């Protein structure tokens, strides 16, 4: 028996990053008795690392129009984005940024006192025909840090109840509705059932399914996994955004400016291999081409290092004065993250996960969806927002500076939806006396696991397998091999050994729970990728190089046979796992093309991808 | 920014663009991504 403590709130938010804080602040400000459950201290959430921008069509540097931001986001999504959610996000963005300013975020300003804005992410004016937009806003060099401190701080006067260093284990589902969350107090080992009328899942990404990612070790897909364990679908988990040049062993990305200033990529044979794949553009080829090229170098046996699993970015041929003046700080960064002296040695680099477009499917109000007999349906009492969700505003490819925006827009949307449908003090639904018992049983099994495989060994094997089979280079045979490997590793979960049997601050146990969650995410990612026989956005297949829509949008629509839903790929992947057996099931649901108001913002029909 | 810190501007006003309270040192977007000390923050 475990000490089990019951709590009752109006609402519970799982996560204290930008999305969860925006939802919890909103609910508390509106008078809801709100709990925020977070495994990390709030200001240590990954959002704190987001030093850059947030897009909003304020029109401070030139004429702008949020409908032009809508267009950029739809096109960037490669027509897997849901245009109703994209309409919502882009139309709300100017108000969201001004709200944040009013709450105390000190966005930088022009001489005339307006929020200063930058061009970024390939954004455009006039539906792609107007040249570059300037709609990216920031705070000093610390936008995400300012966002977390602003929202966390402002919530305190409204008495949000923070459960810090609590690990959410599962949703409290009853008869198809969510009634709260069951969580582990990591400090003392007690089990807490936090009942609420509405639950918001804002748990961030799952980058740690891969060997190289830009998030810390705590980005383990825990909210995704809770959804899977409830028998609910995850969505589009195969759509993972990579960057070509992350530092090996660190995951820290380095700027394309390293190559713009003259740095070059080298393989184990000392060759400047981009001259082979991009004879004109060389190391300044597009990110997709560089990522693919680096991956082929490693696959074909030309990787560097003891494990031949990375390549080199060479800067030591540039005069040190240039490095110091044109790339100030690169020396410090290379030393800190790679122990490399860039005047003497190359920086080891490999393609690195940065963002998870996929996640928990929602509508534009943040309501979590199930999909039954071809019909989308909301799950009563359950919401999701931020990187953990799939609204889907990013579809097959997130635009730069749209990810901080999605946090605030959809965290706010979840709070607004709850406020519109409920009142503080509404009766909180009851839960059965043994609600959550399966979560406690699992925890106890891991706590006393005495198999033969260390958690860290199984995790590394999964991460390497994902990196080698489900990353930038995707082809059937390799994906199929990877699927078999991930399924075998899933079976190895039953053979884990843990070392700490105690109840106080048992982080060994937490890391094992996180591994279970990572493995569920990895299974769904790789099986979804294997099934999707097309190329779209971040998912590029060597054997299916074309985007497969309901029409051939490279040709005039007049006179084409429209393909049946089951015969094209312009549809979201829905994935499910039987957690006991590891059996993966895939279904599909349509992309939402309709906007919230066609007169205000026209649906953008699919168009050929421009490169 | 310990060993190679980004240049802080007088009154936090960029002398070129007159931006107040924005990114220090060179323009972070000058290579098309968002760079700080050679790290790519976003793209
Ligand atoms: C990695 C990254 C991303 C990033 C960026 C720089 C880096 C290094 N720069 C960006 C930028 O300049 N502009 C932008 O638009 N996006 C940028 N990104 C992406 C963006 O920062 C992230 O997508 C975003 O911050 C994600 O926010 P979200 O609120 O969704 O998630 P989070 O900050 O990771 O917080 C997750 C919270 O969930 C809690 N959690 C997780 N699991 C549990 C469990 N099991 N139980 C309880 N709580 C849980 C965490 O504690 C955390 O609070
Ligand atoms: Na969050
Ligand atoms: Na996502």
Q: Centre a 10 Å sphere on the Cβ of residue A70 and count the other Cβ atoms it contains.
A: 26
Whether the link from the prior residue into A530 is cis, omega within 30° of 0, is no
Q: Mutual orientation of helices A507-531 and A222-229 as an angle, nearest 10°?
A: 70
Question: For residue A181, which ligand has an atom nearest its CA?
Answer: 1
Rounded Cα gap, residues A195 and A54, in angstroms: 34
How far apart are the CA of B41 and the centre of ligand 3, in A? 18
Number of other residues whose CB lies within 10 A of the CB of residue A154: 16
How many other CB atoms are found less than 10 A from the CB of residue A432?
10
Contact B4 A329 (CB under 8 A): yes
The number of beta carbons lying within 10 Å of the beta carbon of residue A391 is 30
CA distance linking residue A489 with residue A342, whole number of Å = 38
Neighbours of A433 (CB within 10 A): 7
User: Candidates A215, A394, A404: which one to mutate for ligand 1, based on the most atoms within 8 Å of Cβ?
Assistant: A404
DSSP secondary structure string, A142-178?
Answer: -HHHHHHHHHHHHHHTTT-EEEETEEEEEEEEETTEE
State the Cα–Cα distance between residues A104 and A409, nearest whole angstrom.
17
Chain position carrying tokens 């267009």: A71
Q: Where are the alpha helices (DSSP H) in A394-454?
A: 403-421, 437-447
Residue A61 contacts B, CB cutoff 8 Å: no
Give the separation between CA A12 and CA A8, rounded to whole angstroms: 9
- Biggest CA–CA distance in chain A, Å, is 71
SS3 A376: strand
Report how far apart the first and last C-alpha atoms of chain A are (Å, whole number).
59
Residue A285, chain B, CB below 8 Å: the answer is no
- As given in the structure block, the two tokens for residue A89 are 């996000």
C-alpha distances (whole Å) from A156 to each of A37, A41, A149, A194, A410 are 15, 14, 11, 20, 21
Q: Is A287 a catalytic residue?
A: yes
| Ligand 1 close to Cβ of residue A414 (< 6 A) | no
Residue A305 tokens read as 């290092």
**Does the beta carbon of A391 sit less than 6 angstroms from any atom of ligand 1?**
no
Index of the ligand 1 atom closest to the CA of residue A214:
1
Beta bridge partners of A348: A312
Residue A119: list chain B partners with CB under 8 A.
29
The answer to whether A579 and A568 have CB atoms below 8 angstroms apart is no
C-alpha pair distances (Å), A89 with each of A12, A407, A598: 23, 10, 15
The percent of chain A in helix, strand and coil, each rounded to the nearest 5, is 35, 20, 45
Residues A370 and A361: their CA atoms lie apart, in Å, by: 8
CA-to-CA distance for B36 and A141, rounded, in angstroms?
8
Burial A309-341 (b: 16+ CB within 10 A, else e): bbbbbbbeebeeeebeebbbbbbbbbebbbebe
Give me the half-sphere count of Cα atoms (radius 13 Å) on the Cβ side of residue A154.
23
Partners of A331 on chain B (C-beta within 8 Å) are 3-4
From its phi and psi, is residue A140 left (phi > 0), alpha (psi between -120 and 50) or beta? Answer: left
Cα(A546) to centroid(ligand 2), Å: 35
Query: Is A53 close to B18, i.e. CB distance below 8 A?
Result: no
Asked whether the beta carbons of residue B40 and residue A243 sit closer than 8 angstroms, the reply is: yes
Angstrom distance (rounded) from CA A605 to CA B10: 49
In whole angstroms, what is the distance from residue A475 CA to residue A477 CA?
Answer: 6
Give the 3-state secondary structure of A299-340. Answer: HCCCCECCCCCEEEEECCCCCHHHHHHHCCCHHHHHHHHHCC
Half-sphere exposure of residue A287, counting CA atoms within 13 Å on the CB side? 25
Structural gaps in chain A: residues followed by a C–N separation over 2.5 Å: none
CB contact under 8 A, A332 and B3: yes
- Max intra-chain CA distance, chain B: 29
- How far, in Å, CA of A486 to CA of A508, rounded? 22
**Interchain contact, A141 vs B21, CB within 8 Å:** no
| Alpha carbon distance A395, A390 (integer Å) | 8
Chain B residues whose beta carbon lies within 8 Å of the beta carbon of residue A141: 6, 23-24, 28, 36
Give A 83-112 residues with CB within 8 A of chain B.
106-111
- CA dist A146 and A38 (Å) reads 19
Strand partners, A137: A54
Looking at beta carbons, which pairs linking A332-340 to residues 24 or more positions away fall under 8 Å? A332/B2, A332/B3, A332/B4, A332/B37, A333/A252, A333/A254, A333/B37, A333/B38, A333/B39, A334/A247, A334/B38, A337/A247, A337/A249, A337/A250, A337/A252, A338/A247, A338/A248, A338/A249, A338/A250
CB atoms within 10 A of CB A383: 30
A404 has binding-site annotation: yes
Q: Is A45 flagged in the annotation as binding?
A: yes
Nearest CA in chain A to B15: A111
Task: List Cα–Cα distances, B9 to A53, A327, A521, B17, B25, in angstroms.
Answer: 20, 18, 45, 12, 8
Q: Token match 């098309």: residue? A: B32
CA distance A128 to A143: 27
Specify the CATH number of the domain A245-351. Answer: 3.90.700.10
Contacts of B38 in chain A (CB under 8 A): 254-255, 257-258, 327-330, 333-334
- Which A-chain residues 112-131 have CB contacts (< 8 A) with chain B? 116, 118-121
Q: How far is CA A26 from CA A89, A155, A194, in A?
A: 17, 8, 19
Q: Cβ contacts (< 8 Å) between A52 and chain B: which residues?
A: 28, 34, 41-42
Span between the terminal Cα atoms of chain B, in Å: 21
User: What is the full DSSP assignment across B1-43?
Assistant: --SSPPPPPGGGB-TTT--BS---SS-TTTTSSEEETTEEEE-
A107 and B21 within 8 Å at the Cβ level: the answer is yes
* Cβ–ligand 1 contact at A200 (below 6 Å): no
Q: Name the resolution in angstroms.
A: 1.4
The minimum CA-CA distance between A148 and chain B, rounded to whole Å, is 17
Q: Which of A250, A258, A328, A406 to mutate to test the interface with B (most CBs of B within 10 A)?
A: A328
How far, in Å, CA of A432 to CA of A290, rounded?
A: 54
Q: Does A159 touch chain B (CB under 8 A)?
A: no
Q: Where are the domains of chain A?
A: 245-351, 437-545
Q: Are A171 and A178 in contact (CB under 8 A)?
A: yes
Report the topology of domain A437-545. Methane Monooxygenase Hydroxylase; Chain G, domain 1 (1.20.58)
Selected for mutation to probe chain A from B2, B36, B39 (highest A CB count within 10 Å) is B39
Technique used by the depositors:
X-ray
Q: Which ligand is nearest to the CA of A147?
A: 1
Backbone angles phi, psi at A608, to 5 degrees: -60, 140
- In DSSP terms, A590 is beta-bridged to A571
Q: Is A399 in the pocket of ligand 1 (CB under 6 A)?
A: no
List the structure tokens of A502: 């105690």
């Amino acid at each position: 028996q475990y000490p089990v403590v019951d709590h009752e709130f109006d609402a519970v938010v799982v996560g204290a990053g930008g999305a969860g804080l925006r939802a919890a602040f909103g609910l508390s400000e509106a008078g809801f008795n709100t709990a925020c459950v977070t495994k990390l201290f709030p200001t240590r959430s990954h959002t704190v690392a987001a030093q850059g921008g947030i897009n909003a069509a304020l029109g401070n540097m030139e004429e702008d129009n949020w409908r032009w931001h809508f267009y950029d986001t739809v096109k960037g999504s490669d027509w897997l984005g849901d245009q109703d959610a994209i309409h919502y996000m882009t139309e709300q963005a100017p108000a969201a940024v001004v709200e944040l300013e009013n709450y105390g975020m000190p966005f930088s300003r022009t001489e005339d006192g307006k929020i200063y804005q930058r061009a970024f992410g390939g954004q455009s004016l006039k539906f792609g025909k107007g040249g570059q937009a300037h709609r990216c806003c920031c705070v000093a060099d610390r936008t995400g840090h300012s966002l977390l401190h602003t929202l966390y701080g402002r919530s305190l006067r409204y008495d949000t109840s923070y459960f810090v260093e609590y690990f959410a284990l599962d949703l409290l589902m009853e008869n198809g509705e969510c009634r709260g969350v069951i969580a582990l107090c990591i400090e003392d080992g007690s089990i807490h059932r936090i009942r609420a009328k509405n639950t918001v899942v804002a748990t961030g990404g799952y980058g740690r399914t891969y060997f190289s990612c830009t998030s810390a070790h705590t980005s383990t897909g825990d909210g995704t996994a809770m959804i899977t364990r409830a028998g609910l679908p995850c969505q589009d988990l195969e759509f993972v955004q990579f960057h070509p040049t992350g530092i090996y062993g660190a995951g820290c990305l380095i700027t394309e400016g390293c190559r713009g200033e003259g740095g070059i990529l080298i393989n184990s044979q000392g060759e400047r291999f981009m001259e082979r794949y991009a004879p004109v553009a060389k190391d300044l080829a597009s990110r997709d081409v560089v990522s693919r090229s680096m991956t082929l170098e490693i696959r074909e046996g030309r990787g560097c290092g003891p494990e031949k699993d990375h390549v080199y970015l060479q800067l030591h041929h540039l005069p040190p004065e240039q490095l110091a003046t044109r790339l100030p700080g690169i020396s410090e960064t290379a030393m800190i993250f790679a122990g490399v002296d860039v005047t003497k040695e190359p920086i080891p680099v490999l393609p690195t996960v940065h963002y998870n477009m996929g996640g928990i499917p929602t509508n534009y109000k943040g309501q979590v969806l199930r999909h039954v007999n071809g019909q989308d349906q909301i799950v009563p009492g359950l919401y999701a927002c931020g990187e953990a969700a799939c609204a889907s505003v990013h579809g097959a490819n997130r635009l730069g500076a749209n990810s901080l925006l999605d946090l605030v827009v959809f965290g706010r949307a979840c709070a607004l939806s709850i406020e519109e449908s409920c009142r503080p003090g509404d009766k909180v639904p009851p839960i059965k006396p043994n609600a959550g018992e399966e979560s406690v049983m699992n925890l106890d099994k891991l706590r006393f696991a005495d198999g033969s495989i260390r958690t860290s060994e199984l995790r590394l094997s999964m991460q390497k397998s994902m990196q080698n089979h489900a990353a930038v280079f995707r082809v059937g045979s390799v994906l199929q091999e990877g699927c078999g490997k991930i399924s075998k590793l899933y079976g190895d979960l039953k053979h884990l050994k843990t070392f700490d049997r105690g109840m106080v601050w048992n982080t060994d146990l937490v890391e094992t729970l996180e591994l279970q969650n990572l493995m569920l995410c990895a299974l769904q990612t790789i099986y979804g990728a294997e099934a999707r026989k097309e190329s779209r956005g971040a998912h590029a297949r060597e054997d299916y190089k074309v985007r497969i829509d309901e029409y051939d949008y490279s040709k005039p629509i007049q006179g084409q046979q429209k393909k049946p839903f089951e015969e094209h790929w312009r549809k979201h992947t829905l994935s499910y796992v039987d957690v006991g057996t590891g059996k993966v099931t895939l279904e599909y649901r349509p992309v939402i093309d309709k906007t919230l108001n066609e007169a205000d913002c026209a649906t953008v029909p699919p168009a050929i991808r421009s490169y | 920014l310990e060993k190679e810190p980004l240049e802080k501007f007088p009154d936090d006003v960029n002398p070129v663009t007159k931006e107040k309270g924005g990114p220090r040192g060179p323009e972070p977007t000058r290579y098309g991504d968002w760079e700080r000390k050679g790290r790519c923050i976003d793209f």
